[PDB]
Amino acid sequence: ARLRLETENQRQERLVLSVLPRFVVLEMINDMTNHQFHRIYIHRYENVSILFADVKGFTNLSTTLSAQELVRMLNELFARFDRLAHEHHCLRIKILGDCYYCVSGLPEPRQDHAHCCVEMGLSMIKTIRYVRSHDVDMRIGIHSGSVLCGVLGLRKWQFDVWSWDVDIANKLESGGIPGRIHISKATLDCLNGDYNVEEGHGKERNEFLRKHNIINEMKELREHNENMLRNILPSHVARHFLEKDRDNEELYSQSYDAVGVMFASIPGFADFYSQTEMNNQGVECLRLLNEIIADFDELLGEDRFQDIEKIKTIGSTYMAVSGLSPEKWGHLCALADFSLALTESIQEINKHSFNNFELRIGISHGSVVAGVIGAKKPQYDIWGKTVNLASRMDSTGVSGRIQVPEETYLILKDQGFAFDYRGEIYVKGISEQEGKI
Amino acid sequence: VYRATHRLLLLGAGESGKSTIVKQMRILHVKATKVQDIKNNLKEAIETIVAAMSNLVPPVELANPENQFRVDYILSVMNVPDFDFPPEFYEHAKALWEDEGVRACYERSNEYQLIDCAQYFLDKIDVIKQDDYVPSDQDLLRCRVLTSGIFETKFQVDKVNFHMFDVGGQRDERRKWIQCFNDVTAIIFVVASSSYNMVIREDNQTNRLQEALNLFKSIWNNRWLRTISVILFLNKQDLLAEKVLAGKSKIEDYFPEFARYTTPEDATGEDPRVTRAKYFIRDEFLRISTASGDGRHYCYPHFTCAVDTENIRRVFNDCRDIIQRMHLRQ
Ligand SMILES: Nc1nc2c(ncn2[C@@H]2O[C@H](COP(=O)(O)OP(=O)(O)OP(O)(O)=S)[C@@H](O)[C@H]2O)c(=O)[nH]1
Ligand SMILES: C=C[C@@]1(C)CC(=O)[C@]2(O)[C@@]3(C)[C@@H](O)CCC(C)(C)[C@@H]3[C@H](O)[C@H](OC(C)=O)[C@@]2(C)O1
Ligand SMILES: [Mg+2]
């Protein structure tokens, strides 16, 4: 019995340690065995380098082939991505839409990020060769600096990194020049001077900040690990990942018909962030952000929202799906209640702090394909046309107001028909969303 | 040795005397630009006096028509932000200050916004004409300056280390306070008492003391600062005493609950009205504290005067004993 328990506990521990590296999971597990603030696991780190990726032609391929096959190709490309990355001392942080970023030497100091740059070039040429056998070109953005690493929230924790340097890296990747790297000075001075690089971008990104783009004990341990499993990944996906068929079946997926998707965003937080000398490196700002996200998650768990499942948080952006687990359109009403409760929560945390924050909300309905895209790292995810429709409705929205797809309900009244936003697929004039009456 | 460093911060509305209390503490125990600041404070004081001479809704007469030329001179130099320090303009300002109209405008300065030190600074004109004297400690503590970014100051007493956190009081800076809401030993709340009659310059409608009290209600009831037990240092007491003794304005002009209020039993040359004024502001802060009390934060009111020194050292000794007690987490 002791041998069997030890083996199963080791398997479960390894399943956790696939994500959430050791230096933070140790602190969590220490805290479980026994506060003016909600407590946060961020640690400062130096000499880190951030790579970024983005499919430039995702709008040129999402409409053509259905969601299932697109997920197939995305899974194979991202499996190559992850394997080739783990080859070169790089660890994925997250997958969001099509974006994919990794750091250099976060758990321990390390440098020579140019090797990962040429590695990215080789991987990208392999992907375009495979796709040709549709524009799938992608832009490289890499910036060097110091970051703060940790996790936020009380549900679906994921490894995440925040800083101004990662913001510069994001802007560098958002610049453009597909197939070519953004190797701004912070990397030239660090790596070497013998590398052959060009003069940099002429002008594509906003001229701001001058980026210079140039047996009982074992049972207790098992209970703790099971709690952390239940706090990280979904139940059925965790069960499927615990036993065999983790790697034999590369892609785990399923398409669903009556699905809703909700996005929420906080644009003003980039205003409040400030890396001065008094607040350590902005750690207090991330403490406030963790408080916001913790309030959102604490609101989620309540009995009034059972069919909605939080998926991910991109910065201050909340992604929540509906209809994934069938156990009628009352779930879209639940999603609308979710948006309303989120707005009241952010207003409450506004009044508790001494600044202003507003929410941009976008809802959509349709059929999705949901599954896990990474075998080594369990990252449940969604895909489909309605996903990017919701993303655009969130990004092409007005702060403090809720935008809604074609009206399929009448319980709580809406308003604001005259929008006729151009969108990205086609023009579509649909109303907006206020509260109940 | 993180605990052994008693770090504490001061929160309050604008011009509540927190920077002055920090400077007075620093000189109590641990230049050219300073003299420049003296001169500039004088310049803005006289500039605001003569601007509100005419801009005030009830017009105020001038003592002599001959000084209308100097009034026009100061009006011309009003819009000008150049750092001009000529002796001729010093003589002009001296001429204005001896006019009864300018003094009456200063007495009626409660209508508009003016720096508090002006009157004292208006008696330093004769010696600031020379511009060569070394300023005294009282002169240094009378100097007026704004604070926007939060500031940290080292401190050592009885062979232990303290830390001063002086933050801004303007609404623009009120978002920055959360940057220092963690791991602070105590809060030294400071509210300008005599500014009960003034109003904020951020909106030009709400009273400075009312805004300060609402900020105190927010800070005391903040869901993240519940185990820190704020300590109250109401500044501005001397100007409050001279203002109530003047009799032109009273608390009932804004708070008739004072007119209903009666003196408490903890009374300490004195007058009843000033004593009950300071006790009433203390009791209003204590009411906000206790009505929002949660059994973990305790308010210890203590009356302070930044320009004074003996009061500063006495109240600082009392507060240092309190912080020494609270450090052990009794
Ligand atoms: N006569 C007198 N003057 C005082 C007293 N306390 C402070 N002052 C003067 O009032 C002025 C304002 O003080 P100050 O420290 O600048 O306020 P503050 O709260 O720091 O200003 P802010 O950053 O919130 S906007 C100072 O120049 C000081 O000399 C006092 O008790 N009596
Ligand atoms: C909270 C952190 C802060 C201020 C800085 C930062 O690094 C970000 O978190 C990144 C860049 C960063 O986390 C990398 C992912 C992604 C999704 C690109 C973030 C968003 O752009 C955030 O902006 C938002 C709020 O959307 C942003 C920029 O906000
Ligand atoms: Mg100040």
Numbering used by the authors:
A (entry chain A): 361 to 394, 402 to 500, 504 to 584, 939 to 1051, 1058 to 1167
B (entry chain B): 36 to 65, 88 to 325, 329 to 390
What does the paper say about this structure?
To ensure that the observed conformation is not induced by the detergent micelle, we reconstituted AC8 in MSP1E3D1 nanodiscs with native brain polar lipids and prepared a cryo-EM sample using similar conditions. As the density of MANT-GTP was not well resolved in the detergent-purified structure, we replaced MANT-GTP with ATPαS. We reasoned that ATPαS should be a better substrate surrogate than the nucleotide-based inhibitor MANT-GTP since it is structurally similar to the substrate ATP. After multiple rounds of 2D and 3D classifications, the 3D reconstruction resulted in a 3.97 Å map of the AC8-Gαs complex and a 3.5 Å resolution structure after focused refinement of the AC8 catalytic domain-Gαs complex. The conformation of the nanodisc reconstituted AC8 is similar to the conformation observed in detergent. The N-terminus, C-terminus, C1b, and CaM remain unresolved. The density for ATPαS was also not well resolved in this structure. Together with the lack of a well-resolved density of MANT-GTP, these data are indicative of substrate and inhibitor conformational heterogeneity. One possible interpretation of this finding is that forskolin-binding favours a conformation of AC8 that is compatible with high turnover rate (i.e., binding of ATP, fast conversion of ATP to cAMP, followed by rapid release of the products), but not with high affinity binding of the nucleotide analogues to the active site. It is conceivable that neither MANT-GTP nor ATPαS accurately recapitulate the interaction of ATP with the active site of AC8. We have previously observed the substantial flexibility of the AC9 ATP-binding site that can accommodate MANT-GTP in different poses dependent on the presence of forskolin. It is thus possible that AC8 binding of forskolin produces a conformation that does not favour a well-defined and uniform nucleotide pose.
